[PDB]
């Protein structure tokens, strides 16, 4: 179970002076999604390459999935999987219609539900009940990444969590609770004048999964004073 945020650990959006658009895009409509696909290549020992194509916008013909270790790449190489992630292009390396992401891979066979399950997201602002809504999945075991993306995607659209130039919130973190264990991600960029998408998204490279029946989601936002 992950230690909760230490005092002053959470990133403050006011200390980020670059453009918040570079965070927003990661949780806008476009993302990598493929169902029942199998890897076709590999660059380095901790990645897998899939022939997942963006036919709608034409932005990529292949996706490189990066994991934290060799064991994860080996586990999924040659398995039929589902892929779901927030992808990036700047400093995406395959050695030009390519994209990279971290984690987001679940075995297909035996992981499918026959109906969608709902997971309630509870959102708090300055300690108060702000709103709640449901995200849905048809996976028994679903990546935290997929649930985080679905959660933030809603909050961008409906609460302007990220706007092109800034955020209306000072801090935010999303906490996942599964039985006796929890963990969380900071929703705001690191302080300074540039946002490193690759470095941010690398947090998902553990391929962390949760049980879609058991998992609960709480989002804690604080407003700028």
């Amino acid at each position, epitope marked *: 179970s992950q230690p909760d945020p230490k005092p002053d650990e959470l990133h403050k959006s006011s200390k980020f002076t670059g453009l918040m658009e570079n965070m927003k895009v990661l949780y806008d409509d476009n993302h990598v999604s493929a169902i029942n696909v199998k890897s076709i290549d590999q660059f380095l020992y901790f990645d897998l390459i899939y022939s997942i194509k963006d036919t709608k916008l034409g932005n990529y013909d292949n996706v490189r999935v990066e994991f934290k270790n060799k064991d994860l790449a080996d586990k999924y190489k040659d398995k039929y999987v589902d892929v779901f992630g927030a992808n990036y292009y700047y400093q995406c390396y395959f050695s030009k219609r390519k994209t990279c992401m971290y984690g987001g891979v679940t075995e297909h066979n035996g992981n499918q539900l026959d109906k969608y399950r709902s997971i309630t997201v509870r959102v708090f602002e300055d300690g108060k009940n702000l709103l709640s809504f449901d995200v849905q999945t048809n996976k028994k075991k679903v990546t935290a990444q997929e649930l985080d993306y679905l959660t933030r995607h809603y909050l961008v659209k409906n609460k302007k969590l990220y706007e092109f130039n800034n955020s209306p919130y000072e801090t935010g973190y999303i906490k996942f*609770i599964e039985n006796e264990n929890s963990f969380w991600y900071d929703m705001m960029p690191a302080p300074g004048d540039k946002f490193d998408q690759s470095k941010y998204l690398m947090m998902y490279n553990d391929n962390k999964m949760v049980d879609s029946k058991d998992v609960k989601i709480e989002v804690y936002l*604080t407003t700028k004073k």
Partner: antibody
Amino acid sequence: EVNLIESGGDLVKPGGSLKLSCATSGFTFSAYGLSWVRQTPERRLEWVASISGGGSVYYPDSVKGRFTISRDTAGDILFLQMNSLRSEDSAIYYCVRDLYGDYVGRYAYWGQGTLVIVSA
Amino acid sequence: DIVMTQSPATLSVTPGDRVSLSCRASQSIGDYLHWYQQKSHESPRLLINYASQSISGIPSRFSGSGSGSDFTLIINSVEPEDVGVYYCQNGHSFPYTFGGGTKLEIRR
């Protein structure tokens, strides 16, 4: 692991003042919603004050402008300053912490409570 | 303010009974409704959060249901150690408010 220890309860004359303290341990003090809830002689529970992780404070109308919730993050101590005390303020005062995080309306951990008596 | 009503305010039950305790809110609070047990000489203890969501450490015989204005706590096969006062609580909006409690006593 989580522990909350209230102190400062006393007998005070109507119109007097008292400051309560809640010394905490076993968790990151700034990461949770913290509140005071009181239990009256009639056994009713009443929400008295809340402070969010970011320091936003909230009160019911019955204590607004008389009570002040505050904290000392470095000391892991939560306070309740009570002014212009009334007989209706006589109660056991408990310090409480949220179950998971920065929500102030869910009381998962309670102290043993400290007794306040308002009478001449 | 949102007034929380617990009625019956007292129950006398037989060990092994399935016991149903009622809480009603004067305005809708969605599922932002939490339940507490208080035993003699102890502080209250959180049993259920968000109407029906169970909490690590609480015995399985405790469960909850409802959304909006009408809520129920169920003790499935009540035990002698369950005697005490059960409170519901609006955690939806300010002021946070508690029900008056239902006092549970057991037969022997």
